[PDB]
Ligand binder design. Structure first.
Ligand SMILES: Cc1cc2ncn([C@H]3O[C@H](COP(=O)(O)O)[C@@H](O)[C@H]3O)c2cc1C
Ligand SMILES: Cc1cc2ncn([C@H]3O[C@H](COP(=O)(O)O)[C@@H](O)[C@H]3O)c2cc1C
Ligand SMILES: O=C(O)c1cccnc1
Ligand SMILES: O=C(O)c1cccnc1
Lengths: 340, 340
């Protein structure tokens, strides 16, 4: 059950962490001089699915794909079918995340959680419905649909471990998805909509006030409770955002690391950590998204990304680009010599 | 000759850059959404040694190693022999840069430009003297020694190309080397010493005022001319800093990219770009050093690093950690599909 999953996420292993820190401090360098590589190695050492040491085996980027009813509000410049076209392109290896994942030695798992099109052969089918409800007039979904998809995606994630995967990355695809993301950041952080609504996929600036108004309307109509992250997801999120939260919950349940992507992912991470604070030690930032609301979301997660790429592609591309940073931390730990 | 080398650094290829930009804008994504990956690919396309396209072949991190007379002023906590011990460890593959270079598929070239010890078998010997002169009482070296070492190291660098290397990284090793680095940043940027002197290799805070005083003294005694970067290097730099400048000049002469490291490298890049402004399009930042003077140096180079690792190891480790970012830009360019 989902209550049992949340309950059973392990604490980080303090003993393992202390053993890793003592190891690091004895390496061939001034103490502390590898900076956040050192801290990342210790962070990884405490994740129980890594068996007491910083290591990377297989890598998986899980790309959650869905359509959104709020597309009808005029908040996205791209036509709705682009979600389906780009999900199919993911199965061919031609998208940004595909190419970056291949550089990293990672596999991309393309997951349809609610595309408004016929199912695409080759994509993993977890579809809740053909797009979620339009958040400007009512909820994205029912509470039950959100909890079922959390549990499904969490189980899928953990099951990859059972297959060799030690490091996850999250991403999404869905036209209009930066609207619900902004809604959820506004709810969880207490920030006004204006502070967290961006251009998404090159929305013209002339259309920004409409998008702010839509966010505020979604919130006012649905009255999401910020102390119930499931409620927030269900009311003002989307199936893609639920899916990403699910990957985070499942990785945490398996005691394994998950790399965030950009702003969409930060909104899902705010939900995951409200739902289960025990998720937080498993999350690793990648990059600092170019979306307006990035800073605020990151501040609330107490996260400082490694990469400043002015990226806003999504779909997991940042996560993939950071996987060699994680591998680097593990290589430093295992392969450096010792001062003594 | 060194005058001829400087004269013959090629301009970037604007045609190649325009061809790359048009290619990029046609890739399977919203225009501009890969952010600085896009700009980096176009930057690389204009470098004539890359043959009109962003690509990476062989990779080399050149680690310039020397001792400094100013060590006698009390500005470094590590004993002087650590330079020699750590240079020998570089030949064994046990240092930070070695392990990160191996992750990146790069080779480390350890170059002795003036270690105060017997020559170390296996290290490339370009030694000017057994340590440079103490910059608090006089010059580090003569003008002629600085120009000879520039030319030597520039030629060595370019000769690697002639062997398959397309991407360089720079680093250094030398006890007390953060003192001359701060001197040169102070000279080139106009900043007071206090603004740019840091802790280096974990100097105790109680010893900082002494290090500031030493920098100001070096400057006052030598009167380096900030409009003559060779003069600045020779007077208030060191052999390691000259060596790094030489790698930059040689990479630029060969029309090839060079990744910077941390603060030491930023001081050498300020010198290289004063000496030959034509170097600048070939320089790629890696990380944002944790040294105090990092921001000021970077601002003067108009550079924004990709990586925020709070690193201050040196020796090329940041450069190595950024090599997969360069490879990523090339993979995006070559392997992504097209919108059309
Ligand atoms: C070809 C294409 C590929 C993409 N991959 C990610 N996104 C990104 O942009 C979309 C959200 O922005 P908005 O809220 O402005 O619609 C999502 O699909 C997101 O990951 C894409 C967008 C496009 C157009
Ligand atoms: C074991 C060891 C390895 C290093 N590798 C780089 N550095 C770094 O620290 C030195 C300069 O700092 P300062 O000006 O405070 O002496 C250089 O060798 C630099 O790359 C090292 C320092 C130590 C001690
Ligand atoms: O940071 C995000 O991933 C992002 C922002 C805008 C559009 N698509 C993705
Ligand atoms: O950024 C640098 O590389 C640095 C700073 C202090 C000490 N050693 C290296």
């Amino acid at each position: 059950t989902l209550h049992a999953l949340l309950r059973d996420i392990p604490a980080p292993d303090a003993e393992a962490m202390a053993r890793a820190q003592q190891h690091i401090d004895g390496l061939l360098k001034p103490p502390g001089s590898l900076g956040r590589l050192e801290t990342l190695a210790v962070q990884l050492a405490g994740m129980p699915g890594l068996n007491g040491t910083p290591q990377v085996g297989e890598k998986a980027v899980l790309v959650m794909c869905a359509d959104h009813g709020v597309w009808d509000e005029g908040v996205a410049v791209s036509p709705k079918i682009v979600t389906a076209i780009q999900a199919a392109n993911m199965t061919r290896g031609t998208t940004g995340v595909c190419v970056l994942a291949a550089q990293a030695g990672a596999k991309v798992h393309v997951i349809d959680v609610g595309i408004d099109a016929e199912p695409i052969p080759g994509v993993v089918n977890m579809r809740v419905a053909r797009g979620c409800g339009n958040i400007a007039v009512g909820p994205a979904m029912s509470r039950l649909q959100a909890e079922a998809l959390l549990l499904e995606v969490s189980r899928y994630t953990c099951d990859l471990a059972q297959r060799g995967v030690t490091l996850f990355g999250v991403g999404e695809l869905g036209m209009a998805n930066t609207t619900p993301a902004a809604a959820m950041v506004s709810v969880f952080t207490g920030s006004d909509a204006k502070e967290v609504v961006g251009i998404g996929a090159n929305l013209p600036p002339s259309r920004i006030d409409n998008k702010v108004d839509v966010v505020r309307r979604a919130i006012a109509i649905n009255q999401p409770n910020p102390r119930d992250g499931i409620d927030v997801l269900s009311k003002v999120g989307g199936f893609d955002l639920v899916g990403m939260t699910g990957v985070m919950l499942g990785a945490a349940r398996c005691g394994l690391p998950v790399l965030l992507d950009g702003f969409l992912s930060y909104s899902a991470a705010l939900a995951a950590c409200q739902i289960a604070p025990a998720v937080r030690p498993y999350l690793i930032p990648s990059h600092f998204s170019a979306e307006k609301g990035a800073r605020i979301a990151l501040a609330h997660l107490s996260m400082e990304p490694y990469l400043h790429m002015a990226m806003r592609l999504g779909a997991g591309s940042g996560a993939a680009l950071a996987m060699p940073i994680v591998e680097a931390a593990c290589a430093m730990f295992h392969n450096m010599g010792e001062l003594a």
